[PDB]
Write a protein that binds this ligand. Sequence first.
Ligand SMILES: NC(=O)C1=CN([C@@H]2O[C@H](COP(=O)(O)OP(=O)(O)OC[C@H]3O[C@@H](n4cnc5c(N)ncnc54)[C@H](OP(=O)(O)O)[C@@H]3O)[C@@H](O)[C@H]2O)C=CC1
Ligand SMILES: [Zn+2]
Lengths: 297, 115, 208, 86, 460, 96, 125
Amino acid sequence: LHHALIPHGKGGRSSVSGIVATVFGATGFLGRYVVNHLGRMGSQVIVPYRCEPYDTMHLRPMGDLGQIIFMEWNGKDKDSIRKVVEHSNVVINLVGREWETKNFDFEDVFVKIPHAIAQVSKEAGVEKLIHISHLNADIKSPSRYLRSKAVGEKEVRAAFPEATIIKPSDIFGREDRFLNYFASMRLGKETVKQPVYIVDVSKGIINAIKDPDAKGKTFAFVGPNRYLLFDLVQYIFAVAYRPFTTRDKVERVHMSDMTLPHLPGLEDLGIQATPLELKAIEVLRRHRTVKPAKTVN
Amino acid sequence: GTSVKPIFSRDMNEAKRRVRELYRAWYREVPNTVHLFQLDISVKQGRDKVREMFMKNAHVTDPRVVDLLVIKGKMELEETINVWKQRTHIMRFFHETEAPRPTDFLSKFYVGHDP
Amino acid sequence: TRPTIRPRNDVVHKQLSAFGQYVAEILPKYVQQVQVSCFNELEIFIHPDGVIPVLTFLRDHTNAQFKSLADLTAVDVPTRQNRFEIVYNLLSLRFNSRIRVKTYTDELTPIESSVTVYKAANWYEREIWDMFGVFFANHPDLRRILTDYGFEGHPFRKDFPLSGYVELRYDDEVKRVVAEPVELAQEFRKFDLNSPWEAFPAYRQPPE
Amino acid sequence: LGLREIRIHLCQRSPGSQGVRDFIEKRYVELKKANPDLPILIRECSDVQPKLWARYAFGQEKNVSLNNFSADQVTRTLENVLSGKA
Amino acid sequence: SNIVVSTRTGEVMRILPRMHEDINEEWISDKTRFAYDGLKRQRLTQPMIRNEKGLLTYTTWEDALSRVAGMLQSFQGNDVAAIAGGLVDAEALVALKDLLNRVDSDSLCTEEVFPTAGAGTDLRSNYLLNTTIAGVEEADVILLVGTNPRFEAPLFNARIRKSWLHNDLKVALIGSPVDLTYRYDHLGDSPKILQDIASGNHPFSQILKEAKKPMVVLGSSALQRSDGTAILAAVSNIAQNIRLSSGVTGDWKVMNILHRIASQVAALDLGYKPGVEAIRKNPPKVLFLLGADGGCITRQDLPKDCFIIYQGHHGDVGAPMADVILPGAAYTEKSATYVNTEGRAQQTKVAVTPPGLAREDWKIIRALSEIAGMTLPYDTLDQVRSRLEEVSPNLVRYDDVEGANYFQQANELSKLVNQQLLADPLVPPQLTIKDFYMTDSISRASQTMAKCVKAVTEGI
Amino acid sequence: GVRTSPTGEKVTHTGQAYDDGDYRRVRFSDRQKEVNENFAIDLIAEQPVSEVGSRVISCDGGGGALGHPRVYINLDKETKTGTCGYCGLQFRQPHH
Amino acid sequence: QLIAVDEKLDITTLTGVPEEHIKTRKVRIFVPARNNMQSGVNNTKKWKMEFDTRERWENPLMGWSSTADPLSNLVLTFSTKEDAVAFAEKNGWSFDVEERKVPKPKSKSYGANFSWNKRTRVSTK
Ligand SMILES: NC(=O)C1=CN([C@@H]2O[C@H](COP(=O)(O)OP(=O)(O)OC[C@H]3O[C@@H](n4cnc5c(N)ncnc54)[C@H](OP(=O)(O)O)[C@@H]3O)[C@@H](O)[C@H]2O)C=CC1
Ligand SMILES: [Zn+2]
C-alpha cells in the first residue's frame, strides 16, 4: 500500500488517511463541501483552478499545512490533467456549469472534459474515479443539460470501466441554486421534486471513496420526501416570511424528478437523508427581514 | 468520623434540592436561549441536551461534589443568560463536526492501536 | 564573601524575627508557624479558619497596618493531601515592610473570601477559582476571569496537560468556529534536564 | 463432554489449601499412573481460594472451590469429575 | 534481564541496562544491547495474501481475516494446529489456546522440545531454574550438563563467574570443552557418564555427596537431541541420589533447568505441548505459525494444499511459505508478559507503536475469533490478564520467583519409562562466539550482528 | 556534487529523494525543490593534507576565536592521517 | 459544622478531563531507574507517576512527530508511593505500582585484591 499512504492518527486535522484526492471543480458549491470533508480528516487534496487565486482563498483553512495543493489547468489540454492527477489515487469530478458560454457548451462541459479526465486517470493509474451526473439524465431528454449528462456518463464508463457514478437529485444547501432561486423571485401543481441536502451528498461521496465494493456501481442520491413544486415554493416563501437561467433552467425545473428504485441510494452507504424541514430555516434565515408542506409518498 | 467542611449543604437531600432548582432554571431558559442566539436546533433538542448533561453526573454520591457541580452549572447558566457566550460556545455542546467514534472491538482494531 | 555574593542584612533579619514573635504571640489560635528566609522574607503559616482574622489584624493593628495587598495567588503541590497553597503578600507603607501569609486547602474545602478586608483580592480570588478550582465562600461574584467561556478544567493544576484537551478552528460546513480534540503536527518535546549529583547539600533530606 | 485437561490451583501457605497440598504429596503420583494422557496442571495461588478447573470439548470449563477440603474430599470430587458423574 | 528502551520522536534509539539485583545486576549481553537494529529491517507491516500467480500481495485486514476465518470454520478438530515461536508473549499464547479450544484442538506445539514423559509439564518445578539466578551465589558446587551458558544465557554465566570468583564455587561440565571464562572440571563428553555418576562409580558422585549446597543445571539444547527423556531421567536420578544420601538440607532445590528461548516457560505454564512431534503424528490441514521461524516444519512435512497462517513481525524462514501473513507487534511495541527461566513473570511496556498496519498479537487473534463467530470473552488487556490468571495464576504476580518444590513426584514419574541413551557426545549448538550473535529473527535481520559475525570470522 | 534520481529529482547531500510511487512529489509540481549544490563532503575532500613535523598538532579551525574549540591530534599512526573532529582538516607527519 | 460523611474521594466530574482519558488510560507509579551512563543517584529519590504511551506518527510535511493524546508529556512527582496512589485513585485512573529497587549493601575490601590463596587476587591494577 506504499507506506507513505498508510493511515495514521485519530482521524483529525493533522492525521493521515491515505487518500490523495484530485477534486476537479472544487471551487463550486459542492466542491467546497467535498474539500472540507476530505481535509478535516487528514487527507491531501489537490485542487485545479481555472479562476483567480483569490476566489479559491476560502478553501485554504480546510486542511493542515501542505495538505491542500493548488494547481492551474484547463479542460482543453490533456497535459494539465496529466500533471494534476499524476500522483492521486482518487479523482473526483465536480466540473459542471448550468448555462452556456462562448467557449464552453454543455458538450464541452459534460462530455469532452469528463471523458478526457477519465482517459488520463486510467492512463496514470488512478485507482478510483468518482463522477457526478444528474438523476434526470437520459439521452432522450429534451433538455441539452440532461442529454449531455447521458452522453458523458456513458463515455466516462467506457473510458473508466470501474468508475463510480453518482446522480444527485436537485441538491439544496446554503449556497445552492434551488432555494436561493425560488426565494429571489419576490407554474406548478403537476411537477414533483426530490431535493437532497448538500452535506448528505458530500458524505456520500466520501463514503463511496471509503467503500471498496462501490467500484462499478451507480448511485442515486435522493431526499426523504417528495414534494409538489407548488406547495414546496409555498413553504419556501413561508419560511422567508414573504407574501406569496435563461431557457434550460425553467425547462429543467418544470421537469418532474425521475424514480429509479433499482439504483442504490444514500442509505446503502449509511446516510440518513436529512429532511428539508430542518435545513430550510438554516438556508432561508437570511432572506427574511412552521407548517411544513405536504409530501406525497 | 471523616469529618469534612460543608460548602452549601449538610446532606444529600439539600444537594438534590439544589440540583432540581438548577434543572428548573435550565429548562426555563432553553427556549429563550434557542430563540435569542438564533440556534438551528429545536427546543426539544436543547432540553434533551440539558437532560444528557445532567445525567452525565448521576453517579455522584458526595454532597460537596454535587453542589460544586451545581455552582459550575449556575456559572454556565449565568453566562448563557447574560449572552456572554456566542453561538459557537453554545453549539459546541453538540459536537456536530466530530466523526462518530466507534465502540465495537472490530472497528477499533481496524482504525488503529487506540483501545 | 567577595563581590560575587549577595550582601547579608542582619538588622532586618532580627527585626522581622521579632515581629514574627509579636504576631505569633498575639494570635495563637490560628498561626501554625513563622519563618524568616536568608534574603529577609518573612512568611507566616496559619490555619485556613484564621484567614479573615489574621488578615484583619495585620491591616488594622497600630504596629502592623499592612494596608496594601500586593498579590494573592495559589500553588499546586499534588503530593500533599491539602493540594493547594494559598499565598497572600501584604505591604505596609507605614513601616516600609512586606509580609507573607500562607494557607492550605484541597479540592472540596472552600476558603473564606477576603474581599471584606481587601477590595484588591476580589479579582485575585476569581483568578484562583479560574486557574485552580479553589472555591471562595461569600465572594460577591465568583466566576471565570481568564479562560474561554465554557472552558472545562482548571489549567494551572499540575495534572492539566500543557496543550489542554480541545483546540479551535473554523468549519465552513457549519459556518462557525468549532472546538475539536487537540492534535499536534509536532508533539512537544519533553526534556529530562535534571542531573544526578545533588547541587546544594544544605537542603539534603533525611534518608528515612 | 470429553475431558481434555484439569487445572488444580492451590496456595502454598494458606491454611485452606492445606488438605489440597497433602493430596499431591500423598497421591498425585497415583493419579498420573491411572491417566497417562490427561494433563493435570498444578498451579500456585496467593490469598485466593483453592480451585479445580475442568476443561471439556469446544473450550467449555467448569470451576469448583476446594476451600478447607481434605485429601479425601478432593480425591472424591476429582473421581467424580474424571468419571463424568455429577 | 530488565532494560530501558530509549526513544525519541517515536523511534527506538538504544537499549540500556536497568538494575535488578536478582536477575542481571547491572549488565546486559551484546545481543540484548545491539540487536534492536533489526527492528527497523525485514519488517512485516501490512497483511498479505496469495494471488492467482501464487505470490504474496498486500491486502486489507478485513480480507485477510475473512480468508483465515473461512478455513477456520470449514475445518475443525485435529485438522487445525498451532506452533509458537521464540518471541511470543503470554497474551497471544492464551488467545491462540482459547481460539483453537473453541475448535476442539489441542495441537498447540512449540519449536523447543521438552520431554513430556511422566510428569511432563504438569509440575512446574520440572522445567524451571529452581535455584534461581540469585541462588547461584549460595551454591558451593555446580554441575552443567550439555550446556554452553556463556552463549545460551550470558547473564547466568556471568553470575556463575562471580560466584566462582568470590565464593570459590567449583564448576564441572559434561559436554564439549567450551570456554566458560573460568576453569572448570571437564568430567567428559559422553552422556553415559551421567549414569556413571548415578551409579556412584565416578568420583564426582563423592564430590556432590560432600557439598552443602549442590547444584545440577540442564539445558534444553541437550533436551533437543531426542534423548531428552533419558537425559532428564538421569539428571533427576542424580538429584534424587544427592537428596537421599546427603539428606534434605532444606529448601535448596538442587534440580534446575536452564531455558534458551523467551516464550518457553510462558507456553508450558499455559498447557502448550512442548515439541512439534504432535504435528508430525497428525499433520494438519491448516496451520498457525504464531511467530514460528525455526524451520522445524516445512511444506514437505505437511499435506498438499495446506493452509499456513504466519503472524509475526519479521519476514524470515517462516513467512514465504505462508498463505496469509498477519503483521504483529514486537516486544518494544506492546505491553506483554514474558516468563524467564527462573519462572518469574515480567511485563514489558509500550515504547513505540507497531509500524504500518501491524497490531497487537492478542488483538489480532481476538479479532480473527470474532470474525469466525467464536468471539472470545475478553476485549481489553485487563480482561486478557484475568483470563491468564484463570489459566495460570502465577502469570499475574509480576516479580515473584518463589514456588512449590514437587521434585519427588516428578522424579518418581520419570522412572516408569526406561529409555536408553545414544552413543553420541553432547555437543551444544553454541560452540563458539561466532554462533552467538545470530539466533532469532530480530538478530538475523540486524546489521550490527552481521558486522559482529564478520569481525569474529576475520578480524582487523 | 549533486546527482540526479532516476525519476529526475536532485539528490541532496543527505541522500534523500522520493521514490517512484511516492505521492509527496506532487508538492514539487509547478515549483522547484530546494537543494544545496555545494556538498560539504566533496569540498572537504578537495583540501590538501598538511605536513607538520610534530607528534601532536593543534587545530582551532582558523580565525582564533572565530573558529571552533582548540583540539590536539596525535600523528603517531603512519597508516592514516589525523582528522580534526570539528573542522575536518587532515594532518600528517612527514613520512619518508 | 462537619458533615462526617464516609465515601472515597472521587473528583473526576470536577476536573474536566474527557471521559475516554480516564477509563482508558493506565498510569504507572514508579521510582525511575538510575541512568546506567552515570553513577549519580539523585534522580532516583522521588516517585513519578506517568501515563501509557499512545501512537506517534509522522507528519507528511517536514516529517515531524505528531501525536493525538494530550497526556503524552504529563509526569507528576510525589514524595511517597502512598501519595501517588491516593492521587491516582481520587483522579480515577487505573494504576500499576512498582516497588522501589534499592542496591543491596556490598562488602568492598581493598586488601582482598592482594590475596594469598583466594581467587580475588587481581592480575594488575
Ligand atoms: N443543482 C446541483 O447543485 C447539482 C449539480 N449536479 C452536478 O454537480 C456538479 C458540480 O456541482 P455544483 O457545485 O452545483 O456546480 P457549480 O456551478 O457550483 O461549480 C462548477 C464547478 O465546475 C468548474 N467548472 C465549471 N465549468 C468549468 C470549465 N468549463 N472548466 C473548468 N472548470 C469548470 C467550476 O470552476 P469555476 O468557478 O472557476 O468556473 C467549478 O469548480 C456539476 O458538474 C453538476 O453537473 C448534480 C445534481 C444537481
Ligand atoms: Zn579543525
